[PDB]
Amino acid sequence: RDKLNNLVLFDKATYDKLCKEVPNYKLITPAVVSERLKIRGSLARAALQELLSKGLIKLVSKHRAQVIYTRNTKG
Amino acid sequence: HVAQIYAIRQSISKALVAYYQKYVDEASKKEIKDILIQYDRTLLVADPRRCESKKFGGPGARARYQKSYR
Amino acid sequence: PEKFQHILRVLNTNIDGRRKIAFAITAIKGVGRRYAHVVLRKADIDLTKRAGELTEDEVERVITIMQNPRQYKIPDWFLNRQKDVKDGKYSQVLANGLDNKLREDLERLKKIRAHRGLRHFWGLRVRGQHTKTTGRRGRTVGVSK
Amino acid sequence: NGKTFNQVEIKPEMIGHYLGEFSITYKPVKHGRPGIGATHSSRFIP
Amino acid sequence: TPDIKLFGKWSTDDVQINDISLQDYIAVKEKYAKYLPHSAGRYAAKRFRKAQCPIVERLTNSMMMHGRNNGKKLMTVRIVKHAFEIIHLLTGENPLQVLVNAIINSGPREDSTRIGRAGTVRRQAVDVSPLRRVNQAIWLLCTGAREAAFRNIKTIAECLADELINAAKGSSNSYAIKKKDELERVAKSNR
Amino acid sequence: VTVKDVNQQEFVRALAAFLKKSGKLKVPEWVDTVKLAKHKELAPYDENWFYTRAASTARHLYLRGGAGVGSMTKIYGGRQRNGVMPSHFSRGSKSVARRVLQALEGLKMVEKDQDWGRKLTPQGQRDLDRIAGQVAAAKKK
Amino acid sequence: LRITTRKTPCGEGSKTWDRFQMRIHKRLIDLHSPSEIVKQITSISIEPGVEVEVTIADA
Amino acid sequence: RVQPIKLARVTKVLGRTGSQGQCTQVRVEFMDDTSRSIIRNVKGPVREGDVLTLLESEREARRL
Amino acid sequence: MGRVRTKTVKKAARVIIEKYYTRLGNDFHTNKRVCEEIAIIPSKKLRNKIAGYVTHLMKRIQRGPVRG
RNA sequence: AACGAGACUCUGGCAUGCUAACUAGUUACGCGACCCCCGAGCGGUCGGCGUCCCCCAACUUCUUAGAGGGACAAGUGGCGUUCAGCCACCCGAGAUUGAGCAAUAACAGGUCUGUGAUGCCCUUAGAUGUCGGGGCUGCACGCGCGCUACACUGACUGGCUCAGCGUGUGCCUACCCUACGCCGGCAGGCGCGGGUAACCCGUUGAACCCCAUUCGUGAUGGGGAUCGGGGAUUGCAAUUAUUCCCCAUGAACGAGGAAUUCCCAGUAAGUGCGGGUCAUAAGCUUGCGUUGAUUAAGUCCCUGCCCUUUGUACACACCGCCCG
């Protein structure tokens, strides 16, 4: 085992980066938010649900055990 | 859940055929036969495979309990 | 958001604000996960957020709803103890009192000196179990010359 | 027990229990010194 | 399209085998394209019979291993539908051409074996069948995603699609293209 | 439409909500202390589980010939992890299902009919197929 | 009828068993006619050890 | 070595060798020269008419 | 595979061709039914074998002389 | 010429051919009843959904079990002495679906605790032949067969949806399987009814699987050992906890050395169920379904076995014999 740092709620830099990482990244899953930031992972699940209501991300597929989200579906 | 899916497919394939075999001519259904049997996947045929009967000295039909010499 | 507080101390055990409310509370002895999802609902609060997001007003109510469970209409069968024995009532025991209570019942069964206390004092299994192939701490045995 | 009548005084603190919990029926156990075949080494003599 | 199945959305046309060596044991589109990878359970009762069944199905078969996952072929197909999806968003290709490169780049060119002399280990270099290459390459990359997701927050779908990228474009960040080159490095030595 | 046509995951999630609006279902007091079956290790997350289960009760009666408190439990029962011992099947609670079916019968969406089992009232059968089309109206079947 | 039991008394040696089976057969012919001539003709003209059971009514 | 990747195809299978039958002798045609032929040892199951990927044709087989 | 014919087949096959040479065809099914009538073979599977060998012999007897 | 091999028996796989069925179904209406316009139309009708109604209806495809047929290396192409056979292919169920039965001769193999089978010896009233109690479960240790685990291909909580081999009171001496109604969180209690069983339980409304929430890489909510208190059931009796249930307690264990077992197609592995023992009780054994891979189409290297030739100081047979 190991020790990895995580945060269960946001602070400034995480939250502000969260809005601007979106157009920079084509793939968006909660797992990828775990590594690029230090985020719990369950935090990232609900964080993406918020963004989809704004239309800053787009759903592309959904399942019980895995969920995919994309940038804006533009090209 | 699984084997039912193959059963309903196998029946509807043959059902369609039989309707043409009885009320329409040969050359209608001969055509349809060539199409299905091309990607045959047990649509017009049936597996003969069913479970084999277990014999003693194993939990399965082939697999056996462990053997110790000491 | 919600940067207000994190790790805190409550009665007899330190409880983190890192974890969800119900599961956080379980660390305190005499409270399992099953016991906590009840007590939160009698308190009529969310269990869908962290323990660091509770206020002092709220957690003050929690311990009251916990330590008088019969008076907030949690059934008798759902308690740890029903008629302790020689105390005459239904009871619910929590962290540091649990150990004190436990050590009494050990002492009692060597006081009378039943089969129980002897097995306890010898360090052998209380319940019907074989000890022939069960245990080991020990195994270094030799016999040659 | 099996042969022996172990006498006991009855306390008011023993109520609810059975009689047979206060008299044992085996020697607690001691050991030992492992014996011969007590392992994968014991064997041979001639 | 109306006479040949896609994959449920993915064309099997505009898909090539870019070797002349490894085709006729890699095929996916001659008529062997189907909506799903599944069989009635005929796959082997002759040595040649193994070859015929699709590459995409073979991948699904070798994905379920190690005890708890055996006999759960439907759960396995969930991982494959996400894989192609992730591969297409992530790089943007016909996501089968990714897989075909990933298989061809992971198959060994020369291999070693054992030979008994003097009661001591000696090794001999030998060649390898095209059918061996395909079987090996399917084994190796599936071990990668299985290994990575054994304590990672990442799901096996994500891990597997990453593993096909680094195989399809060699970069030695995969479990496959590493282990390929290990064998060939041995085969040079004892030869 | 008949209830056969539609998805059933969707069916219950609109039927559960329907009942709770209309003041229907007089619920037992015990609903926040209830494991819900012998083979569970926890209470439900859901706080309106009673409403959800009454949906699934009335649906099965539409299909099959109707049966008592015993049979409902057998339909719901699942696997019991006995720890170190191997898992086995077992049946869940009874006294919950005995409150469910009597609560439905108070609304006269079911009734004790002949041949050893409650059966769903024509008023009940009307209300099922009424909201069955509401499902297709909603999304689009 | 299945009986699956040891082939070895006082178990020793390789563990073996033995499947025995008995197959019963039932079949019935329904007549509707006067009960006299039936009970007359039925009980006679039977060579083997085969059982017969007459019933008053069933339908 | 410094030879580029060669390709050569089976003409005939000869028989199996090795000390567990794990190696297979085979005759192969060079696929650029139709009168050239070398014998090889090949590990995997082969049929006939399939193509291999030789790293050299300096090597040649003679025994197990 | 396997399934090399036994001597019980080869003994009676020769006999049946010698004394009923005329009745034989060269079809499987016709040569079966003849063996069923000119003799009784007490099994069904055995009958299907003895016919097939009787057929296979009758092919060669229409060439040079057999030595059996 | 004979025994074994094979032949044989059982089982699986092929029948819209044959035989016949309210203790098995299907179809067809007759329908009348319920339901929603859900589609054309209006709600009727036509179509769709199941149930009651079903017959003096029609039929036997499905289910059931009987009589029969079918596969033979049969046909074709290679190969073989062109013999015996072998390889590929067509048709198609390919010449191997799995079991039962099994020779000569032998073993100082197991069983006097299956036997009112049995020799001889012993014991036989202070009995080795009956009631009460205790023990076969006692642990510093060594080994074998297994079960459950070490998580995210997961756990947890809801929702959906599929099966088969069987078995059951009227038996042993007191006992079965359970629907339905009522009461209880649960274990369970209580009131009624059916089943001699293709008739009642059971259209066996099972698990894995499937669909949607929650947890987040943390010895964590993974794991459930240890242990405290309380409630039920069986019995004449439950203490060294018979079994079952509720709350609490929360350990080792984070993929395993030297070694080693088993397996080739509905097979391995995962997963549940019935029977056996049973007053109460399977982590065992014996059968059955369900989901269902990877790898091989070989070889004598290891271990071992069959046949020939050869050598031998061996025959209690190399686990032999024999020297200072």
UniProtKB/TrEMBL annotation, chain E:
Among PANTHER family, the record links this protein to:
RIBOSOMAL PROTEIN S7
Record's PROSITE patterns? RIBOSOMAL_S7
Recorded hits in NCBIfam families, A to Z, give:
PRK04027.1 (NF003106), uS7_euk_arch (TIGR01028)
Q: Molecular function terms in GO for this entry? A: mRNA binding; structural constituent of ribosome
Q: What is this protein called?
A: Small ribosomal subunit protein uS7
The GO biological-process annotations, alphabetized, read as: regulation of translational fidelity; ribosomal small subunit biogenesis; translation
The keyword Ribonucleoprotein appears for this protein: yes
Give the quaternary structure. Component of the small ribosomal subunit. Part of the small subunit (SSU) processome, composed of more than 70 proteins and the RNA chaperone small nucleolar RNA (snoRNA) U3.
**Residue ranges of the Small ribosomal subunit protein uS7 domain?**
33-191
Q: Which residues form a coiled coil?
A: none
Tell me the leader sequence span: none
Chain's role: Component of the small ribosomal subunit. The ribosome is a large ribonucleoprotein complex responsible for the synthesis of proteins in the cell. Part of the small subunit (SSU) processome, first precursor of the small eukaryotic ribosomal subunit. During the assembly of the SSU processome in the nucleolus, many ribosome biogenesis factors, an RNA chaperone and ribosomal proteins associate with the nascent pre-rRNA and work in concert to generate RNA folding, modifications, rearrangements and cleavage as well as targeted degradation of pre-ribosomal RNA by the RNA exosome.
Record's keyword terms, sorted? Ribonucleoprotein, Ribosomal protein
- Answer yes or no on keyword Ribosomal protein: yes
**What's a GO cellular component annotated to this UniProt protein?**
small-subunit processome
- Family from the record: Belongs to the universal ribosomal protein uS7 family.
